[PDB]
Write a protein that binds this ligand. Structure first.
Ligand code: GTP
Ligand code: GDP
Ligand code: MG
Lengths: 439, 143, 426, 94, 141, 23, 49, 49
C-alpha cells in the first residue's frame, strides 16, 4: 500500500545507487539473483519489500528505481557485474554522448533527446504503485548530466505531477578540492531551476566524508565504493520508519514540512552518527546521549560549515535501533542547555523525532561495525550561506574575465542567464541573512 | 524485566539484554494451519517464523486469490505466552514458549490453536544438524 | 558507441604511427597476425573505438596514413606490425615535397587531398557515433605540414561539430635539421591555430634529455622516442576504452583546458619513467608520481614553467587506486606552489581515474597542461623568421609557386598578435 | 519426515537452446573455427583445454551468452579438462 | 649497463665477426602457413645477413595473383620462439633445415629449398649443424 | 645452572579494502 | 640565494596569515560568548529582584 | 625585482605579526571578562537560592 520511487542522475547517482540497492537487498534478504534463496522454499515473510521491490508471480522482486546517465561506460558495469539479473533491462537509461562537464550540453542539446524516454518509464512506475508519496533525486552538482539534464527533469516533473513530493540528495562541490574546473558554472546555473522546482534538498560534500571516514573509522585512504555505503546507510535510516515498525513513524511528508519554513529556504543538512570501526565498537559504550552529542558536534558534521558561526532553524531526529523514549527526552533537554549551540529566537521548538525498532544491518566487507542503535540528523541551519559566499566569490572572479563563456553561448542558450543566475542567488543570500536577523 | 531492579537494587539500573545472543544470532519457518471446530470459512494456511534473536515468534498469512479474507500479518515480532495462565503476582519470571517446535505439535498461540504441518528446507536442515536439542531427528533412534 | 578516427601525415607521422598502434595492440592484446590473444574479457568491450570488425575474428585499425613519397610505405609495411594495416588505407604520391611547406599546400598536396577525403569519408560514416579525429604530423617537413594543414582546413568545414586532436611536432633550436623549417613552421601554425581544438608540442630535445638523464640510456633510437610519445598518446584515452571511477574523454578534458578558443596549447608529461638500475630502489606510490611529474625535466616541450604561469592543468590516472592520496597531493602542490598558478581562476586541476594500468605496470599518470610559459617557443621562431625574411632570401622556392608576398605578412601578423594575447596572463 | 528425507531417490535441451540462438542470429561461419583449430593444433592429438576454445569463441564474437557457453564448455564436451574438435564443431551447426 | 655499472657505457660491437663476414647472405625458399585459405601458395625468400645475424623476408610478386607482395619483412632480428625477457635467444643459421618451420612474428614458414651457395656453406661448416640437416641436404642433392 | 607497519607501501597505499584492523 | 630567501618569506607570510584568520575567528566567537554572558547576568539579577 | 619582493614580504610578515599580538591581547581580555561574568553568575544564583 506504500511505495517509494528513486531517480538517480549522473555518474555520482548511478554509483551511489549501486551501494544503495545492495543494502536494500540485504535488509530484506534479497539475493543478487533477485529472489529469496532457494534454500527457503516458502516466503512472503512480511510485505516490507513491497515499497522498494516489485512482485512477480514467479517470485522475483524487481526494484522500483530508474538510473539515468549520459555515459554508457559506468552504466554497463551494472549489466556486467554481480547484480545483472536483479535490475530490470529497461530501468537503466543509457545515453550515447556525455555532456562533458558542461551545463548547456546536458540541458538544451543532449538532455532533450532522452527526457521523453525516461518519462515513459517514470509514468510506467507511477501507475504500478497505488500510493506514492513522491520522488527521491540522487544527483550531482558538478556533473554534466546531474546539472543540465536534472534542470529539465525537475521542471517537467513539476507539471507532470503537481503536488507530489520532491526530495533531492545533491553532491555539493567541496569548498577546497574539486575534480573539475567549470563546476561553479555547473553549480550556479542549475540553482535557478532547483530553488523553485524542488521541495527539499539535502547537500552532501565529499571532502567532509573524506576526513570523517579517515579519523573515525581508522581507515586511511578510502574509496568511493565505501563512501556510497555511508550515504546508502543514510538513505536507509530515513526510510526505516516507512518499511519497519517503530514506536512512532515518520513519513516522507512529515519532515518536508518541518524543515522548510520558507519556500526560498529549503536547504537542510545531513549528519550520521555513530561512525566507528569494529575494533572501536566493543570498548566504548554507545548510549543515546553519546550518539546524539556527536551529531550536534561540528567535527562530525557532514557538510563543511560550522553551526557555531550560524544558527539552526529546524532539526530532525531519526532514531533507529534499541532506543527507549525516556533518555531521548533527557538528551534533547540537555541539548537545550548548552549555550554553545545557538538556535533562532522565533522557532523555540525545533525538534521532531522518529523511532524505529530494528537495529541497522551490516554488509560483508563494509567499514562500519555491527551497531545496536544509531541516529541521523536532518538539520536546517544558516551556515550554508558561509559556503555559498565562498562559492560566488570564486564564481565572480572567474566570470570577470569571461572565461569558458564560448563553451555555453554557442550551444544555443543566451548569455543573459549568467547575469540572472548571479542576481537571483544574490537575492537568495539576502533572504538568507534576513531570516537570520532576529527581532 | 524492567521492574526486577527495584528489589535487585535500591537504585534501579537499566535492563541488560543479551549482547552475545544478539551478536551470533537464521529464521526458522514452519507451516501451520488453524484448528478449531468445523467452520467452513476457516481453511487458512499460515507460516510461523521463529527469529532466534530476542526469542520471538511472528505468524503471517500469504494473500490468497479469490478468498473472502486477506490477512497480511497475524502477529508483529512479539513473544508468545503459553496457555498456563497465572498472569498476576507470579513470583518467578514468566514462562515463554522456547524454541521447541516439531512437526505435528499443536501450539496454542493467543488462544488460537495452530497445527504445525511442514518445515522449510533450511528448518529441516537445522533439525537434522542440531540433534542434542531435538531427539526426534535422530536417524539412529528413529530406526 | 564512440569511435576515434586516427589520421597520420608525413614520414614522422608514419614512424610515430607504427609504434602508436604497437602499444595499443599490446594494450588490447593483439598479435602481429591480427587475432586477439589475451586472457581477460573487459579487453573486448571497447574495441570498436579503434579497431573495425571483420570476418574470421580480425580487428583492423581505422587509421589513415598519408605521405608524398613511396619510400615510407615500404618501411611501414616492413615493420613488425605492418601486416595488420589494411593496404587500402595507405595514400602515397609519385613525388614528394622535400622540406617545403609551399609544395604541399598549393601544388603537390592539392591533388592528394581529393583522394584522402574519399578514404576518410568511406570510413568515418561507417561508425555509429564518431567522437572525433586525431592528428599526428610534423611541422619540420613540408610533406606532412604543407598538406597536413590543408586536411585541417578541409575536414573542419565538412564535420564542424567534432573534436580534433593534434600531436604536432613544433621544431627545436638545437635539433634543427632543416634550413627552411622556420618557414615551414610559421606558415603551418598560422593555418593551425584557427582551425583546431587541441594541440600538444612534441619536442625532440625533451625526449633526448629524458632518455639520457631520467631513463639513463646510451643509444636512444627513434623507436625509444616513439615509445615515449605514444605512452602519453595512448594514456589520454584511457577512460574511453576502460571503465573506472571518473571517466573523462577528450572533450571533457578540452572543456576544462580551453578557456578561450585561442588557448589550446599544452605540455604533455608521463610519470612512470625510471631507469632499470633505479627500478627496484624506488617505491611506486602516488606521491612519487605527482612529484616526479611536476618537475620541469619530465615535460615534453622545450619550455620552462618557472618563467610562466600554470594557467590550467589536467591529470589522468590509471590503475586500481584510492583517490584520498591523489586529492591530498594535488591540493598540497596547489597550496605550496602558489606563485606558479594564476589567481583569476580557482580549482585549475582536472581529475580523471581509470582502474586498468598498462602491461608491466600497476599505476600511472598522464599530464596535459596549458601554461603561459609555452609562448617562449613562438618567440624563438618569430625572431628567426624575421631574420630570414628581412634579407628576402629563399623566396624563389615560395613566391614562384603562386604564393603572394603579403602571405608572409599575415603569417607574421596573426602570430605576433597571438603571442601578444598570451602575454597578458603572466 | 526425517526417515523419508534421508531415504529418497535423487543435454539436448542445452544444445537446442544455442541452435535456436544461432538460427535467430546468423553465425554459420564454423569452417573458420575448424581451420583455426587445425592451424594451432600443431600435434597429432585432436584435443585442447577449454580456455583455448572459449577464447576462440569470445574472439570470434558469437551471439551466445557466457552462461550457456560456460555450461557447454564445462559439462558435456569436456572429458578431462580437454575438448574434442570435430564433435564439438559438428555440433552447434544447425 | 645500468644493472652492472654505475656509469653506463655503449655495448661492444662484434666487429671481428663483422670483418669476417662483410657481405654474406644465405637465401632459402619458404612457404607461409596460415589459417586463411588464400595464403596457401605464398612462397617467400629468406635472407640471413651473417654480419649482424639479421633476417629479412621478401615475397616476389606472382603473375596474376592479386596480392601486392614485396618487402614482407626488413632488417630485424627474430627472437620469438621460447625466449625469456631477461635473456633473448635468436634464430641462427644452424636450424635452417629442409622442412623446418620458423616462427616469425606469429607467422609460420616452411623451408623447402636452399641455394648452391648455401649447400657449399653447409659442406664447409658441417659441424655446428644437426645431423637431420645433413641428411636433408644429402637427400636434396 | 651449576647442576646443568609491516610495509610503508601497505601503510601509504590501498588501505581501503584492508583497514588498520585488517592490516 | 635571494630566490631561496623569497620562497622562505612567502611560506612565513602565508602561515602567519592563517594565524591571523584563526585568531579573528577566535575573537568573534569570544565576543558572541561575551554577549550571551551579559544576557544571562541581566536575567539572573532581574529574577533576584 | 626580487629584492623588492623580499622587502614587501618582510613588511607583510611584520604587519600581520603585530596583528597576531593584538589578537592575543583581545583573547586575554575576553577570557578575563568571561571569568568575571561567571563569578557574577554564581553570586546571583546563590542569592536566588
Ligand atoms: N560521493 C560520491 N561522489 C561521486 C561519486 N561518483 C561521482 N561523484 C562526484 O561526481 C563528480 C564528477 O561528475 P560526474 O558525476 O562524474 O559527471 P556526470 O554526472 O556523469 O556528467 P558528465 O560527466 O558530463 O557525463 C565528482 O567530482 C564526484 O564528486 C560517488 O560514487 N560518490
Ligand atoms: N620524435 C621523432 N621525431 C621524428 C621522427 N621521424 C622524424 N622526426 C623528425 O622529423 C624531421 C624530419 O621530418 P620529415 O621526414 O621531413 O617529415 P615529412 O616531410 O612530413 O615527411 C627530423 O628532423 C626528425 O627530427 C620520429 O619517429 N620521432
Ligand atoms: Mg554522465
Amino acid at each position: 500500500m506504500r511505495e517509494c520511487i528513486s531517480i538517480h542522475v549522473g555518474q555520482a547517482g548511478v554509483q551511489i545507487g549501486n551501494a544503495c540497492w545492495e543494502l536494500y537487498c540485504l535488509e530484506h534478504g534479497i539475493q543478487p539473483d533477485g529472489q529469496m534463496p532457494s534454500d527457503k522454499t516458502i516466503g512472503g515473510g512480511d510485505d516490507s519489500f513491497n515499497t522498494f521491490f516489485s512482485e512477480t508471480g514467479a517470485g522475483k522482486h524487481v526494484p522500483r528505481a530508474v538510473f539515468v546517465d549520459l555515459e554508457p561506460t559506468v552504466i554497463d558495469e551494472v549489466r556486467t557485474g554481480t547484480y545483472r539479473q536483479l535490475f530490470h533491462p529497461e530501468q537503466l537509461i543509457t545515453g550515447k554522448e556525455d555532456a562533458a562537464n558542461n551545463y548547456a550540453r546536458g540541458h538544451y542539446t543532449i538532455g532533450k533527446e532522452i527526457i521523453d524516454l525516461v518519462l515513459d518509464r517514470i509514468r510506467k512506475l507511477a501507475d504500478q504503485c497505488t500510493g506514492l508519496q513522491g520522488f527521491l533525486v540522487f544527483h550531482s552538482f558538478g556533473g554534466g548530466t546531474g546539472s543540465g539534464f536534472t534542470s529539465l527533469l525537475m521542471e517537467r516533473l513539476s507539471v507532470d505531477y503537481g503536488k507530489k513530493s520532491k526530495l533531492e540528495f545533491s553532491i555539493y562541490p567541496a569548498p577546497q578540492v574539486s575534480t573539475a574546473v567549470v563546476e561553479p558554472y555547473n553549480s550556479i546555473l542549475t540553482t535557478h531551476t532547483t530553488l523553485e522546482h524542488s521541495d527539499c534538498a539535502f547537500m552532501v560534500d565529499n571532502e567532509a566524508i573524506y576526513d570523517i571516514c579517515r579519523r573515525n573509522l581508522d581507515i586511511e585512504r578510502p574509496t568511493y565504493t565505501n563512501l556510497n555505503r555511508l550515504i546508502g546507510q543514510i538513505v536507509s535510516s530515513i526510510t526505516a520508519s516507512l518499511r519497519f515498525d517503530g514506536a512512532l513513524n515518520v513519513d516522507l511528508t512529515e519532515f518536508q514540512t518541518n524543515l522548510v519554513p520558507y519556500p526560498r529556504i529549503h536547504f537542510p543538512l545531513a549528519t550520521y552518527a555513530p561512525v566507528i570501526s569494529a575494533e572501536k565498537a566493543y570498548h566504548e559504550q554507545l548510549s543515546v546521549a553519546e550518539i546524539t552529542n556527536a551529531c550536534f558536534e561540528p567535527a562530525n558534521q557532514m557538510v563543511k560549515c560550522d553551526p557555531r558561526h550560524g544558527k539552526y532553524m529546524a532539526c530532525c531526529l531519526l532514531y533507529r535501533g534499541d532506543v527507549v523514549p525516556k533518555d531521548v527526552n533527557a538528551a534533547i533537554a540537555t541539548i537545550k542547555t548548552k549555550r554553545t549551540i545557538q538556535f533562532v529566537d522565533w522557532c523555540p521548538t525545533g525538534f521532531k523525532v522518529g523511532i524505529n525498532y530494528q537495529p541497522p544491518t551490516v554488509v560483508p566487507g563494509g567499514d562500519l561495525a555491527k551497531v545496536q542503535r544509531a541516529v541521523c540528523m536532518l538539520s536546517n541551519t544558516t551556515a550554508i550561506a558561509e559556503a555559498w559566499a565562498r562559492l560566488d566569490h570564486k564564481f565572480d572572479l572567474m566570470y570577470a574575465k569571461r572565461a569558458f563563456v564560448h563553451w555555453y553561448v554557442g550551444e544555443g542558450m543566451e548569455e543573459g542567464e549568467f547575469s540572472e543566475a548571479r542576481e537571483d542567488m544574490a537575492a537568495l543570500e539576502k533572504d538568507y541573512e534576513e531570516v537570520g536577523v532576529d527581532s | 524485566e524492567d521492574s526486577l531492579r527495584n528489589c535487585i537494587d535500591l537504585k534501579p539500573t537499566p535492563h541488560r539484554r543479551n549482547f552475545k545472543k544478539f551478536m551470533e544470532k537464521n529464521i526458522l519457518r514452519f507451516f501451520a494451519k488453524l484448528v478449531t471446530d468445523k467452520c467452513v470459512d476457516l481453511d487458512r494456511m499460515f507460516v510461523i517464523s521463529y527469529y532466534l534473536g530476542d526469542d520471538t515468534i511472528s505468524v503471517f498469512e500469504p494473500i490468497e486469490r479469490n478468498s473472502g479474507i486477506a490477512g497480511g500479518m497475524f502477529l508483529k515480532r512479539s513473544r508468545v505466552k503459553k496457555p498456563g495462565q497465572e498472569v498476576f503476582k507470579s513470583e518467578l519470571s514468566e514462562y515463554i514458549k522456547a524454541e521447541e517446535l516439531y512437526i505435528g505439535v499443536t501450539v496454542n498461540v493467543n488462544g488460537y490453536l495452530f497445527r504445525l504441518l511442514n518445515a522449510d528446507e533450511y528448518t529441516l536442515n537445522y533439525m537434522e544438524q542440531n540433534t542434542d536439542k531435538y531427539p526426534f531427528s535422530n536417524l539412529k533412534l528413529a530406526l | 558507441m564512440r569511435e576515434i578516427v586516427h589520421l597520420q601525415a608525413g614520414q614522422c607521422g608514419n614512424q610515430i604511427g607504427a609504434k602508436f598502434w604497437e602499444v595499443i595492440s599490446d594494450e588490447h592484446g593483439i598479435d602481429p597476425t591480427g587475432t586477439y590473444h589475451g586472457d581477460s574479457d573487459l579487453q573486448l568491450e571497447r574495441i570498436n573505438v579503434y579497431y573495425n570488425e571483420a570476418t574470421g575474428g580480425k580487428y583492423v585499425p581505422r587509421a589513415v596514413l598519408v605521405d608524398l613519397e613511396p619510400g615510407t610505405m615500404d618501411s611501414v609495411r616492413s615493420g613488425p606490425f605492418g601486416q595488420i594495416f589494411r593496404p587500402d588505407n595507405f595514400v602515397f604520391g609519385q613525388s614528394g615535397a622535400g622540406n617545403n611547406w609551399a609544395k604541399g599546400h598549393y601544388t603537390e598536396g592539392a591533388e592528394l587531398v581529393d583522394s584522402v577525403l574519399d578514404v576518410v569519408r568511406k570510413e568515418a560514416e561507417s561508425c555509429d557515433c564518431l567522437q572525433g579525429f586525431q592528428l599526428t604530423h610534423s611541422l619540420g617537413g613540408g610533406t606532412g605540414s604543407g598538406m597536413g594543414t590543408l586536411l585541417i582546413s578541409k575536414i573542419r568545414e565538412e564535420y564542424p561539430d567534432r573534436i580534433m586532436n593534434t600531436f604536432s611536432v613544433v621544431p627545436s633550436p638545437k635539433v634543427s635539421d632543416t634550413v627552411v623549417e622556420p618557414y615551414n613552421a610559421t606558415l603551418s601554425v598560422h593555418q593551425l591555430v584557427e582551425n583546431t581544438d587541441e594541440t600538444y608540442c612534441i619536442d625532440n630535445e625533451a625526449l633526448y634529455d629524458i632518455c639520457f638523464r631520467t631513463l639513463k640510456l646510451t643509444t636512444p633510437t627513434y623507436g625509444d622516442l616513439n615509445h615515449l610519445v605514444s605512452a602519453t598518446m595512448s594514456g589520454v584515452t584511457t577512460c574511453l576504452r576502460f571503465p573506472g571511477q571518473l571517466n573523462a574523454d577528450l572533450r571533457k578534458l578540452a572543456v576544462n583546458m580551453v578557456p578561450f578558443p585561442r588557448l589550446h596549447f599544452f605540455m604533455p608529461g608521463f610519470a612512470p619513467l625510471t631507469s632499470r638500475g633505479s627500478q627496484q630502489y624506488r617505491a611506486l606510490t602516488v606521491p612519487e608520481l605527482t612529484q616526479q611529474m611536476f618537475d620541469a625535466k619530465n615535460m615534453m616541450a622545450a619550455c620552462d614553467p618557472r618563467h610562466g604561469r600554470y594557467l590550467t592543468v589536467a591529470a589522468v590516472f590509471r590503475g586500481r587506486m584510492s583517490m584520498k592520496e591523489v586529492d591530498e597531493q594535488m591540493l598540497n602542490v596547489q597550496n605550496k606552489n602558489s606563485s606558479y598558478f594564476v589567481e583569476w581562476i580557482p580549482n585549475n586541476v582536472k581529475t580523471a581515474v581509470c582502474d586498468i594500468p598498462p602491461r608491466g605496470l600497476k599505476m600511472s599518470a598522464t599530464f596535459i597542461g596549458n601554461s603561459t610559459a609555452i609562448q617562449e617557443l613562438f618567440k624563438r621562431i618569430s625572431e628567426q623568421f624575421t631574420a630570414m625574411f628581412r634579407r628576402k632570401a629563399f623566396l624563389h622556392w615560395y613566391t614562384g609557386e603562386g604564393m603572394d608576398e603579403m602571405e608572409f605578412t599575415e603569417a607574421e601578423s596573426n602570430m605576433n598578435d597571438l603571442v601578444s594575447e598570451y602575454q597578458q596572463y603572466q | 519426515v526425517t526417515i523419508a528425507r534421508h531415504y529418497r531417490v535423487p543435454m539436448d535441451f542445452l544444445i537446442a537452446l544455442a541452435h535456436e540462438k544461432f538460427k535467430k542470429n546468423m553465425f554459420e561461419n564454423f569452417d573458420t573455427f575448424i581451420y583455426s583449430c587445425v592451424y594451432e593444433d600443431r600435434e597429432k592429438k585432436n584435443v585442447l583445454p577449454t580456455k583455448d576454445i572459449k577464447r576462440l569463441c569470445k574472439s570470434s564474437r558469437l551471439p551466445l551468452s557466457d552462461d550457456l557457453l560456460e555450461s557447454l564448455l564445462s559439462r558435456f564436451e569436456d572429458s578431462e579438462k580437454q575438448i574434442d574438435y570435430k564433435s564439438f564443431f559438428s555440433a552447434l551447426n544447425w | 649497463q645500468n644493472c652492472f655499472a654505475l656509469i653506463p657505457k655503449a655495448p661492444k660491437k662484434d666487429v671481428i665477426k663483422m670483418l669476417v663476414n662483410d657481405n654474406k647472405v644465405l637465401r632459402y625458399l619458404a612457404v607461409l602457413e596460415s589459417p586463411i585459405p588464400e595464403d596457401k601458395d605464398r612462397r617467400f625468400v629468406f635472407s640471413y645477413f651473417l654480419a649482424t645475424d639479421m633476417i629479412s623476408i621478401f615475397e616476389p610478386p606472382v603473375r596474376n595473383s592479386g596480392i601486392i607482395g614485396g618487402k614482407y619483412l626488413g632488417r630485424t632480428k627474430v627472437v620469438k620462439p621460447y625466449s625469456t625477457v631477461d635473456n633473448p635467444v635468436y634464430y641462427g643459421p644452424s636450424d635452417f633445415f629442409i622442412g623446418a618451420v620458423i616462427e616469425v612474428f606469429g607467422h609460420r614458414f616452411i623451408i623447402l629449398d636452399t641455394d648452391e651457395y648455401v649447400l657449399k656453406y653447409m659442406e664447409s661448416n658441417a659441424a655446428q649443424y644437426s645431423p637431420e640437416a645433413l641428411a636433408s641436404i644429402q637427400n636434396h642433392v | 645452572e651449576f647442576g646443568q607497519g609491516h610495509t610503508f607501501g601497505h601503510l601509504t597505499h590501498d588501505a581501503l579494502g584492508l583497514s588498520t584492523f585488517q592490516k | 640565494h635571494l630566490e631561496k630567501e623569497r620562497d622562505r618569506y612567502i611560506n612565513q607570510a602565508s602561515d602567519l596569515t592563517q594565524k591571523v584568520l584563526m585568531n579573528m575567528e577566535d575573537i568573534k566567537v569570544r565576543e558572541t560568548q561575551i554577549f550571551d554572558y551579559r544576557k544571562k547576568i541581566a536575567e539572573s539579577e532581574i529574577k533576584l529582584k
